[PDB]
Write an enzyme that holds these catalytic residues in place. Structure first.
Site, PDB file in Angstrom:
ATOM      1  N   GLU A   1       0.836  -1.198   0.000  1.00 51.48           N
ATOM      2  CA  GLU A   1       0.000   0.000   0.000  1.00 51.48           C
ATOM      3  C   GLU A   1       0.873   1.249   0.000  1.00 51.48           C
ATOM      4  O   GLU A   1       0.538   2.258   0.643  1.00 51.48           O
ATOM      5  CB  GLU A   1      -1.014   0.010   1.159  1.00 51.48           C
ATOM      6  CG  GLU A   1      -2.013   1.114   1.064  1.00 51.48           C
ATOM      7  CD  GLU A   1      -3.357   0.757   1.690  1.00 51.48           C
ATOM      8  OE1 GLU A   1      -4.043   1.709   2.109  1.00 51.48           O
ATOM      9  OE2 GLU A   1      -3.726  -0.444   1.731  1.00 51.48           O
TER      10      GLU A   1
ATOM     11  N   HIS B   1      -0.614  -8.097  -2.621  1.00 54.68           N
ATOM     12  CA  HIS B   1      -1.707  -7.433  -1.930  1.00 54.68           C
ATOM     13  C   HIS B   1      -2.917  -7.598  -2.817  1.00 54.68           C
ATOM     14  O   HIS B   1      -3.045  -6.933  -3.866  1.00 54.68           O
ATOM     15  CB  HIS B   1      -1.404  -5.952  -1.693  1.00 54.68           C
ATOM     16  CG  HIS B   1      -2.564  -5.189  -1.132  1.00 54.68           C
ATOM     17  ND1 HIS B   1      -2.691  -3.825  -1.284  1.00 54.68           N
ATOM     18  CD2 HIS B   1      -3.662  -5.600  -0.447  1.00 54.68           C
ATOM     19  CE1 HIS B   1      -3.804  -3.423  -0.690  1.00 54.68           C
ATOM     20  NE2 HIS B   1      -4.415  -4.481  -0.179  1.00 54.68           N
TER      21      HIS B   1
ATOM     22  N   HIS C   1      -3.711  -2.679   9.543  1.00 60.51           N
ATOM     23  CA  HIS C   1      -3.232  -4.072   9.613  1.00 60.51           C
ATOM     24  C   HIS C   1      -2.030  -4.223  10.521  1.00 60.51           C
ATOM     25  O   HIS C   1      -1.272  -3.273  10.683  1.00 60.51           O
ATOM     26  CB  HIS C   1      -2.751  -4.534   8.245  1.00 60.51           C
ATOM     27  CG  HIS C   1      -3.844  -4.706   7.257  1.00 60.51           C
ATOM     28  ND1 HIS C   1      -4.283  -5.944   6.840  1.00 60.51           N
ATOM     29  CD2 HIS C   1      -4.570  -3.792   6.574  1.00 60.51           C
ATOM     30  CE1 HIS C   1      -5.242  -5.782   5.946  1.00 60.51           C
ATOM     31  NE2 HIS C   1      -5.427  -4.486   5.760  1.00 60.51           N
TER      32      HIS C   1
END
Ligand SMILES: Nc1ncnc2c1ncn2[C@@H]1O[C@H](COP(=O)(O)OP(=O)(O)OP(=O)(O)O)[C@@H](O)[C@H]1O
Ligand SMILES: *[C@@H]1O[C@H](CO)[C@@H](O[C@@H]2O[C@H](CO)[C@@H](O)[C@H](O)[C@H]2NC(C)=O)[C@H](O)[C@H]1NC(C)=O
Ligand SMILES: [Ca+2]
Ligand SMILES: [Ca+2]
Ligand SMILES: [Mg+2]
Lengths: 361, 255
Positions: B39, B129, B247
């Site tokens: 990310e 991801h 997360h």
């Protein structure tokens, strides 16, 4: 046998083939070396990036600008820029092409000699020529007498030229140009309430500058107009889609060219340096300089700038003097275009310095 | 050797410019010999460069990197970033799976490491991801990525890891039979379906570490694979925790 034309600026390289009507390659005059050890996925370790890739990867690089205020000051990085220009951008072998290069007004002779040495000895070009940027812009406009205002990313000069001869005693240099205007726009938009500071935000601000700014004919009246109505506001949609509105910042930003005090510089504005340059010339050529003020360079692209120059020079000149400002639509590239015209003339082909001459000299 | 995979929510300039949040990210990274950060939303690599500046401020070779270009099907793009300590491991080779945007929204980065401190000498890490709405298909596709690594590098020792979104509404219990990476006995799943890899109040095993190859599976320290609950580790408020990420990193140690 097609000649190459390379016009190296403080901010941008303009490169291409002589006889073309526009440069094929235009890219930032930047060399960046990684600050840390690593690779892009699927790639080997790179020693440096040049041009667009350096700008877009700049966060993990240290950037160098080999050209400062129009003059080459880092020769190792300038070599990288030329290599990238030949091999990556134009995709030519330099030993196959006569090459025209450009230089700034007042470039020291030792600098021109080093440029020449590198071209012949490092790149093995078969012939080359170095031209003064302002003389090329004048030539592109079809004139051999006039006074050029050239304003790019790093420097602004006035260069009076008489029958093709740039007069160096009368050349004026102002160390304010496009990069300063972009930074000042960032500052005043920030004062308004916006937040433009990051690398990316500067990219957007440069775009706002190039799309929405203009030079007011009467700055104080324009400020009053902006205060009394919304008629001068323009909207600008950001990458994310949100729209912002810009008002007097549109004309305050390039006003700085006429009032350098807006960025804390004590210098005469461009109208004053134009007049001062003409006044350094013999009186008998001044009529011709005033009637042939040619604008050149990305930072002269503002709407309004020719009209405002005409007004300000008319205020300074003798009252019966014919004043004409010539601002070609392609003037962001007019140095390169003048070079392209010159290098593609059969007439010119005996002005090339050949490697044989360089070997004998 | 400690290895981790960490989805850092909107990792980019704003977060790295926050001294407090930057310090916590640095502290977490420093735990690992190899870490995969996901990310990364960093258009000019500025945040990546700032993280590396902090990591390498004393010793300039504390961490080296492997980073992708921005990946995604549309305008929303993310990079994969591996940070590794060059004194522990060396990157032998890297590539981006392409067979690419047909199978993955963020085409996996694949890195080959050599590793002299551990039973396994060379092993690959595959990063993913996944797109949550496509999680079943994307995790199933990693099986084909595995075959690719095998074919390319004649290598059976492969770790596949990242935010697979592998739980809750994105992968339900009946859907595991559709995922060859799960159904094949070639793979050991080191983060179990029971683990909570979210810093938020959901209870989801989204983040995963999967290992293939005899030597690699034998290098794993049994019991060492787990989420790193940094809220607990660092005595943080939940609010500070979430400002770091939604997360937790998932980690594993090789012996
Ligand atoms: N339409 C426009 N309006 C205003 N400014 C512009 C426009 N287009 C380009 N510029 C500005 O022109 C500058 C680049 O112009 P140019 O290529 O003439 O400079 P250069 O040759 O790189 O620099 P220098 O001549 O100072 O060494 C940049 O600052 C750019 O933002
Ligand atoms: C860095 O991030 C922290 C954590 O998000 C920011 O702290 C929050 O914002 C303000 C700080 O005045 C508080 O009202 C919130 O309650 C804070 N959250 C937490 C969890 O403390 C902090 O502001 C950021 N620092 C800067 C300078 O941007
Ligand atoms: Ca120029
Ligand atoms: Ca949770
Ligand atoms: Mg669960």
């Amino acid at each position: 046998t097609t000649a190459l034309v390379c016009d190296n600026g403080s901010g941008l390289v303009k490169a291409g083939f002589a006889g073309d009507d526009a440069p094929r390659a235009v890219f930032p005059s930047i060399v960046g070396r990684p600050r840390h050890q690593g690779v892009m996925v699927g790639m080997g370790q790179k020693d440096s990036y040049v041009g667009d890739e350096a700008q877009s990867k700049r966060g993990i690089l240290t950037l160098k600008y080999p050209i400062e205020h129009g003059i080459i000051t880092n020769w190792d990085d300038m070599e990288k820029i030329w290599h990238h220009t030949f091999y990556n951008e134009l995709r030519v072998a330099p030993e196959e092409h006569p090459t025209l290069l450009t230089e700034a007004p007042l470039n020291p002779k030792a600098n021109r000699e080093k440029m020449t040495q590198i071209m012949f000895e490092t790149f093995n070009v078969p012939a080359m020529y170095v031209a003064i940027q302002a003389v090329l812009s004048l030539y592109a406009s079809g004139r051999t007498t006039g006074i050029v205002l050239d304003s790019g990313d790093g420097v602004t000069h006035n260069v009076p030229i008489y029958e093709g001869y740039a007069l160096p005693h009368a050349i004026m240099r102002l160390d304010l140009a496009g990069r300063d205007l972009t930074d000042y726009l960032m500052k005043i938009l920030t004062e308004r309430g916006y937040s433009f500071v990051t690398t990316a935000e500067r990219e957007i601000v440069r775009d706002i500058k190039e799309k929405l700014c203009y030079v007011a004919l009467d700055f104080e009246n324009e400020m009053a107009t902006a205060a009394s109505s919304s008629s001068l506001e323009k909207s600008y949609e950001l990458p994310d889609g949100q729209v912002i509105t810009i008002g007097n910042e549109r004309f305050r930003c390039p006003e700085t060219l006429f009032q350098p005090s807006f960025i804390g510089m004590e210098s005469a504005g461009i109208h004053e340096t134009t007049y001062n340059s003409i006044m350094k010339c013999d009186i008998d050529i001044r009529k011709d300089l005033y009637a042939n003020n040619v604008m050149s360079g990305g930072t002269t692209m503002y709407p309004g700038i020719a009209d405002r120059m005409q007004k300000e020079i008319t205020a300074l000149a003798p009252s019966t003097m014919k004043i004409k400002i010539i601002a070609p639509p392609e003037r962001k590239y007019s140095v390169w275009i003048g070079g392209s015209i010159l290098a593609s003339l059969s007439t010119f082909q005996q002005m090339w310095i050949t490697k044989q001459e360089y070997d004998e000299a | 050797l400690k290895i981790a995979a960490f989805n850092i929510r909107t990792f980019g300039e704003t977060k790295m410019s926050n001294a407090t949040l930057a310090s916590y990210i640095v502290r977490i990274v420093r735990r690992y010999d190899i870490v995969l950060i996901q990310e990364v939303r960093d258009s000019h690599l500025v945040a990546v460069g700032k993280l590396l500046d902090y990591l390498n401020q004393d010793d300039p070779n504390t961490y080296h990197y492997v980073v992708s270009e921005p990946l995604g099907r549309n305008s929303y793009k993310e990079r994969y970033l591996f940070l590794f300590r060059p004194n522990k491991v060396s990157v032998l080779d890297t590539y981006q799976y392409d067979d690419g945007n047909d199978s993955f929204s963020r085409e996996p980065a694949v890195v080959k490491f050599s590793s002299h401190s551990t039973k396994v000498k060379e092993f690959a890490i595959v990063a993913l991801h996944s797109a949550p709405s496509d999680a079943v298909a994307e995790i199933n596709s990693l099986y084909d990525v595995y075959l690719d690594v095998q074919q390319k590098w004649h290598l059976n020792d492969v770790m596949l890891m990242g935010d697979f979104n592998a739980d809750c509404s994105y992968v339900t219990s009946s859907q595991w039979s559709s995922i060859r990476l799960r159904t094949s006995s070639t793979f050991q799943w080191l983060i179990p379906d029971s683990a909570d890899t979210t810093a938020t109040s959901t209870n989801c095993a989204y983040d995963r570490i999967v290992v293939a190859g005899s030597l690699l599976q034998s290098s794993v320290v049994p019991g060492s694979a787990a989420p790193f609950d940094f809220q607990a580790a660092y005595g943080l408020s939940n609010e500070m925790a979430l400002a770091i990420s939604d997360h937790y990193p998932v980690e594993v140690t090789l012996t």
